[PDB]
Amino acid sequence: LDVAMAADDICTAITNGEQVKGLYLYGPFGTGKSFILGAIANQLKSKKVRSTIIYLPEFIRTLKGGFKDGSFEKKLHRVREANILMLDDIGAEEVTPWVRDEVIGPLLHYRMVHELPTFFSSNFDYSELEHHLAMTRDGEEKTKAARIIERVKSLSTPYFLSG
Amino acid sequence: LDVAMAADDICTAITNGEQVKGLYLYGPFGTGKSFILGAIANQLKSKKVRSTIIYLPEFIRTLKGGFKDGSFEKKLHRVREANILMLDDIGAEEVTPWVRDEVIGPLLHYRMVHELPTFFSSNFDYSELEHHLAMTRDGEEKTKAARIIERVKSLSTPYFLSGE
């Protein structure tokens, strides 16, 4: 499939005002998923449309700066209402029950309830990401992973990138 | 060997200060060629690296001034020495002997001699672009098109973009 034209068309749509689904780019490392996300971002910027790109490892490691006091909700509440959000390299973060049920879950829930374009990039497809989310130190919790992954599916359109 | 990964690698290389070969993106209309060229342009721009994109038909309309007593050489000499040049939709211009032999040809020859990064997009592959340049009102001239297309091929790396 041609991801370039999907990116171009979703840029035109976003700039026109149409409600659209983000892109779920998945594939092995070094296939250009991040570059396509950033290309969408710069393309939108060329038309004055803002967007927010997040590298999930660093972002979660930043939210852990205040997991005790609960001040992480300060930044989460700011990132969750972003007009266009792009979660870069989801599924690579350390899947802990806290990040799954207090960061990722709520984030995607809100961005869905308000229909806000959400782009993704991952080394896993939908089901593989669901398995990644279910497994954790507390064991396999399939219902939470199913809820989250269904949010992802309803927020994005899949595209496979290979070498 | 991915398209997006080739663009990303080329951006990382140019931004690190390494002048490298550009890309020859060819494919039907509506396959994202211009989006990839624009993505390279914007990725370079975000790191303070200027680049130049010309749409060959428009550029030619600006030259045909001009097209007699070398006056056009004023602009052709400036575009040709650009740090990074991207020729959007090469092959869509109406080929005439003077456009081919006095604009396109010399431009690519200069950018090749001086080892200047150059990018391309087209609906034609190498062979189809060469055949496109060979044919004009004066007939088919294959050797010229061979020289030019060989410059293009020395200036780029091909990548095919097919629809869904």
Keywords:
homodimer, 163 residues, alpha/beta, five-stranded parallel β-sheet, 7 helices, 15% strand, globular
Number of strands of chain A: 5
What is the molecular shape of chain A? globular
Q: Between the first and last Cα atoms of chain A, what is the distance in angstroms?
A: 13 Å
Write down the oligomeric state.
homodimer
Number of helices in the DSSP assignment of chain A: 7
Strand residue content of chain A = 15-25%
- Helix and strand pattern of chain A: HEHEHHEHEHHE
CATH fold node name of chain A: Rossmann fold
The CATH architecture designation of chain A is: 3-Layer(aba) Sandwich
Number of separate structural domains of chain A: 1
Structural class of the secondary elements of chain A? Answer: alpha/beta
* Order of neighbouring strands in the sheet with most strands of chain A: 2-3-4-1-5
Mind telling me the CATH class of chain A? Alpha Beta
The helix content of chain A, as a percent range, equals 40-55%
Q: CATH superfamily name of chain A?
A: P-loop containing nucleotide triphosphate hydrolases
Q: How many whole angstroms does the radius of gyration of chain A measure? A: 15 Å
Report the largest inter-chain contact.
A-B, 25 and 26 residues
Main beta sheet of chain A, described?
A: 5 strands, parallel
Topology:
The structure is a homodimer.
Chain A: H1 3-16, E1 22-26, H2 33-45, E2 52-55, H3 56-63, H4 72-80, E3 85-90, H5 97-113, E4 118-122, H6 126-134, H7 142-155, E5 156-160
Parallel strand pairs in A: 1-4, 1-5, 2-3, 3-4
PDB class: protein binding
Keywords: Helicase loader, protein binding
Assembly: dimeric
